[PDB]
Amino acid sequence: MKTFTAKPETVKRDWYVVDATGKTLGRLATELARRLRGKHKAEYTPHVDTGDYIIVLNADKVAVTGNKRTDKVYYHHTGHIGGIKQATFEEMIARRPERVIEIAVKGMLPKGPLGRAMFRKLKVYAGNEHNHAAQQPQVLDI
Amino acid sequence: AVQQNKPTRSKRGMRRSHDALTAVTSLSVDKTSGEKHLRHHITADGYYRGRKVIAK
Amino acid sequence: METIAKHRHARSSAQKVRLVADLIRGKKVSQALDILTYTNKKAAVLVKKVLESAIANAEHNDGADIDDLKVTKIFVDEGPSMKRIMPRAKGRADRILKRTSHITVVVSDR
RNA sequence: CCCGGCGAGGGGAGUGAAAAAGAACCUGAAACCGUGUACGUACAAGCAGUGGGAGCACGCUUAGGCGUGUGACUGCGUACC
RNA sequence: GUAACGGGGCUAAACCAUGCACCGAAGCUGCGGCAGCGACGCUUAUGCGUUGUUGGGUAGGGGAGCGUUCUGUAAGCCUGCGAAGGUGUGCUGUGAGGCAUGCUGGAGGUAUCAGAAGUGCGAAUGCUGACAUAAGUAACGAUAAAGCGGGUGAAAAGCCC
Numbered sequence: 001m002k003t004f005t006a007k008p009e010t011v012k013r014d015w016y017v018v019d020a021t022g023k024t025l026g027r028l029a030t031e032l033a034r035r036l037r038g039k040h041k042a043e044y045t046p047h048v049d050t051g052d053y054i055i056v057l058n059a060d061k062v063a064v065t066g067n068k069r070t071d072k073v074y075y076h077h078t079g080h081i082g083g084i085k086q087a088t089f090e091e092m093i094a095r096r097p098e099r100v101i102e103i104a105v106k107g108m109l110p111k112g113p114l115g116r117a118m119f120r121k122l123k124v125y126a127g128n129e130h131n132h133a134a135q136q137p138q139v140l141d142i
Numbered sequence: 143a144v145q146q147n148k149p150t151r152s153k154r155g156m157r158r159s160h161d162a163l164t165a166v167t168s169l170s171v172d173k174t175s176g177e178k179h180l181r182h183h184i185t186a187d188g189y190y191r192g193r194k195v196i197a198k
Numbered sequence: 199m200e201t202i203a204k205h206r207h208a209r210s211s212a213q214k215v216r217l218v219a220d221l222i223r224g225k226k227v228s229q230a231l232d233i234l235t236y237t238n239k240k241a242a243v244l245v246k247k248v249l250e251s252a253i254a255n256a257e258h259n260d261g262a263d264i265d266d267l268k269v270t271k272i273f274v275d276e277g278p279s280m281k282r283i284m285p286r287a288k289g290r291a292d293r294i295l296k297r298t299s300h301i302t303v304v305v306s307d308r
Numbered sequence: 309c310c311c312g313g314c315g316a317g318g319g320g321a322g323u324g325a326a327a328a329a330g331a332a333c334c335u336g337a338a339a340c341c342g343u344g345u346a347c348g349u350a351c352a353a354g355c356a357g358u359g360g361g362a363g364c365a366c367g368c369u370u371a372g373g374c375g376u377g378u379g380a381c382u383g384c385g386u387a388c389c
Numbered sequence: 390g391u392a393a394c395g396g397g398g399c400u401a402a403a404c405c406a407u408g409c410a411c412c413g414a415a416g417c418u419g420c421g422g423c424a425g426c427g428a429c430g431c432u433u434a435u436g437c438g439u440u441g442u443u444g445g446g447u448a449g450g451g452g453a454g455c456g457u458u459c460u461g462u463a464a465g466c467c468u469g470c471g472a473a474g475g476u477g478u479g480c481u482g483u484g485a486g487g488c489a490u491g492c493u494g495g496a497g498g499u500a501u502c503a504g505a506a507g508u509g510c511g512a513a514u515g516c517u518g519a520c521a522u523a524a525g526u527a528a529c530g531a532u533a534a535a536g537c538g539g540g541u542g543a544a545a546a547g548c549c550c
């Protein structure tokens with residue numbers, strides 16, 4: 001006999017919704033990536049995406065410990081020699097509060113074409129309303 | 143000034159992807175003689191829009 | 199039925215003749231002759247003579263009609279190269295290659 | 309005999325056991341250059357393979373859940389003397 | 390160019406102490422198989438019944454083998470009901486290799502046991518020949534200069550008037 005392997009043409013993917021108000025950033029992103037990949041399923045397969053779709057609400061109300069709200073810095077480079085730019089946690093929550101959650105989850109997911117696809121199943125919103133009622137998402141206490 | 147490695151036959155075909163030719167779309171037909179000719183050009187016999195331009 | 203025609207040991211490189219052969223592959227005989235007539239290239243003259251020969255062979259030998267013929271297969275292969283000498287500066291000498299080609303055309307009634 | 313410049317070079321006919329033995333001629337390997345068919349390839353980074361592996365195509369097949377070709381995605385991996 | 394945790398991120402997912410679980414190597418064990426050296430049985434021209442143990446490896450030493458050309462065995466054997474060579478497929482051995490067969494090819498080939506060597510190539514800025522790459526790229530040899538008409542010819546910017 002051989003070992004079972006999933007097939008991307010017959011795998012099931014459900015929808016969920018989560019609230020991020022008052023939740024810890026790092027300890028939340030950890031469980032999202034765990035489900036976007038499929039580790040919570042017995043049919044897990046490294047070369048196949050067996051994850052679920054997840055919606056996140058109230059991204060602008062996550063919490064951080066210590067003085068990270070003012071001392072945590074996000075660096076990035078453009079390509080020119082001037083280059084290096086930076087921004088703080090508070091500055092990002094006011095300009096684009098959705099990047100904080102995405103940047104944290106993108107680092108916990110594997111690299112390559114497959115990891116870039118799991119990220120496409122993550123819908124982040126900065127409010128309390130969404131326009132995906134047709135998919136009938138379920139609540140996920142997490 | 144000169145290469146360090148030998149290019150492949152694959153890279154050679156890519157460079158020649160824009161070297162193809164183009165054929166004439168269509169030929170115009172004269173009103174009187176009924177011959178095929180290039181648009182805005184005279185025919186071999188010497189006709190152009192039915193006026194019997196140069197014959198020799 | 200398929201009729202053949204060839205022109206071996208032609209004075210031209212295969213790379214130059216292939217540019218023209220790609221314009222008539224799979225076309226009708228009547229349409230192909232018009233294309234080559236208004237193509238400004240030396241290779242177009244050689245190919246035309248070969249195509250005309252095949253058309254004549256079909257009628258005389260295979261007893262076919264012109265209106266039903268089509269170019270089904272056409273390709274160009276490399277032929278023998280002639281070696282020549284070219285003097286350069288400071289006593290150095292280079293080699294020159296005059297390349298040839300084999301042309302082949304196939305017409306069919308299908 | 310036919311196309312072609314009373315050309316070069318070819319297609320038929322005929323000779324011959326054999327012309328894909330036609331004088332650039334026994335046998336006719338490799339590098340190198342082409343036509344056709346099946347599969348894969350235009351959001352994806354590195355000695356180009358190896359282990360795992362869906363899908364498509366084809367031949368089987370007493371369906372036998374096998375074989376052959378292609379190789380999305382994924383773990384490891386910096387040529388030889 | 391973040392650049393003094395590998396990263397994301399963490400107020401423990403940091404540090405000290407104690408304790409119970411799990412992951413984790415080509416290490417150990419389990420199943421199957423090959424070989425070397427030992428002792429026993431003294432089996433018996435020796436292979437077993439068995440029984441222990443060993444098996445990373447350069448310079449280098451020792452031991453056993455594959456295949457190629459030629460001589461004898463051969464006025465033998467295979468072969469136009471198709472030899473050598475070339476190109477595919479299948480089977481087989483621990484390996485160098487071997488057997489069978491389809492297409493091509495069109496006349497030579499050679500078992501077994503022995504004998505003799507111009508006996509095995511990827512490299513030496515190696516030798517000879519053939520074919521690639523750069524590339525349809527540079528260039529077409531004094532910047533004294535050409536234009537039109539007619540003629541010949543399959544075709545004339547370059548030949549003749």
